[PDB]
Design an enzyme around this catalytic site. Structure first.
Site, PDB file in Angstrom:
ATOM      1  N   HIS A  62       0.805  -1.215   0.000  1.00  0.00           N
ATOM      2  CA  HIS A  62       0.000   0.000   0.000  1.00  0.00           C
ATOM      3  C   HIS A  62       0.835   1.261   0.000  1.00  0.00           C
ATOM      4  CE1 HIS A  62      -2.660   3.089   2.047  1.00  0.00           C
ATOM      5  NE2 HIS A  62      -3.357   2.780   0.963  1.00  0.00           N
ATOM      6  N   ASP A 106      -5.911   2.474  -2.194  1.00  0.00           N
ATOM      7  CA  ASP A 106      -6.675   2.272  -0.971  1.00  0.00           C
ATOM      8  C   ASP A 106      -7.587   1.064  -1.096  1.00  0.00           C
ATOM      9  OD1 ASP A 106      -5.399   4.510   0.018  1.00  0.00           O
ATOM     10  OD2 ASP A 106      -7.078   5.852  -0.026  1.00  0.00           O
TER      11      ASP A 106
HETATM   12  C1  LIG Z   1     -12.044   6.936   8.673  1.00  0.00           C
HETATM   13  C2  LIG Z   1     -11.048   6.636   9.778  1.00  0.00           C
HETATM   14  C3  LIG Z   1      -9.654   7.185   9.468  1.00  0.00           C
HETATM   15  C4  LIG Z   1      -8.589   6.094   9.367  1.00  0.00           C
HETATM   16  C5  LIG Z   1      -7.594   6.353   8.241  1.00  0.00           C
HETATM   17  C6  LIG Z   1      -6.250   5.680   8.494  1.00  0.00           C
HETATM   18  C7  LIG Z   1      -6.313   4.196   8.154  1.00  0.00           C
HETATM   19  C8  LIG Z   1      -5.548   3.342   9.160  1.00  0.00           C
HETATM   20  C9  LIG Z   1      -4.075   3.208   8.786  1.00  0.00           C
HETATM   21  C10 LIG Z   1      -3.730   1.790   8.334  1.00  0.00           C
HETATM   22  C11 LIG Z   1      -3.924   1.586   6.836  1.00  0.00           C
HETATM   23  C12 LIG Z   1      -2.680   1.055   6.157  1.00  0.00           C
HETATM   24  O1  LIG Z   1      -1.580   1.613   6.343  1.00  0.00           O
HETATM   25  O2  LIG Z   1      -2.802   0.067   5.407  1.00  0.00           O
END
Ligand SMILES: CCCCCCCCCCCC(=O)O
Length: 121
Positions: free
Chosen positions: A47, A89
């Site tokens: 990611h 995402d």
């Molecule tokens: C809508 C709630 C806000 C959260 C956004 C951040 C997402 C969590 C971080 C982990 C995701 C990743 O790094 O794969």
């Protein structure tokens, strides 16, 4: 933006994104990449690598359009860079959902400073 990312992760995994993935392993959430501890962590490694390519927009702050129709993410963004951000995402939300079987709460609040140097993207 982080708003969309968190909504996608809750829709696919059923877990709060900050609590469950905001500090998971060496790659999920805050900080930088490292050597993954498991499959869930490899998802976040991929990611962040996916994010490095986005030079014409901001993965943190720029919002994009998408739908949660029939239990699936559809990117409805026309801005090219924001479209790539949405697909980055979408990919991690789906990937994390697929690896819920090996998700481990031990990595939940990982001490990321001891993480080994990450391989190149
Ligand atoms: C809508 C709630 C806000 C959260 C956004 C951040 C997402 C969590 C971080 C982990 C995701 C990743 O790094 O794969």
């Amino acid at each position: 933006s982080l708003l969309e990312l968190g909504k996608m992760i809750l829709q696919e995994t059923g877990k709060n994104a900050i609590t469950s993935y905001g500090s998971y392993g060496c790659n999920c959430g805050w900080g930088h990449r490292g050597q993954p501890k498991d499959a869930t962590d490899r998802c976040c490694f991929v990611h962040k690598c996916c994010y490095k390519k986005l030079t014409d927009c901001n993965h943190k702050t720029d919002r994009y359009s998408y739908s949660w129709k029939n239990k699936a993410i559809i990117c409805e963004e026309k801005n090219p860079c924001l479209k790539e951000m949405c697909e980055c995402d979408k990919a991690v939300a789906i990937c994390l959902r697929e690896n819920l079987d090996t998700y481990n709460k031990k990595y939940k609040a990982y001490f990321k400073f001891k993480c080994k140097k990450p391989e190149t993207c």
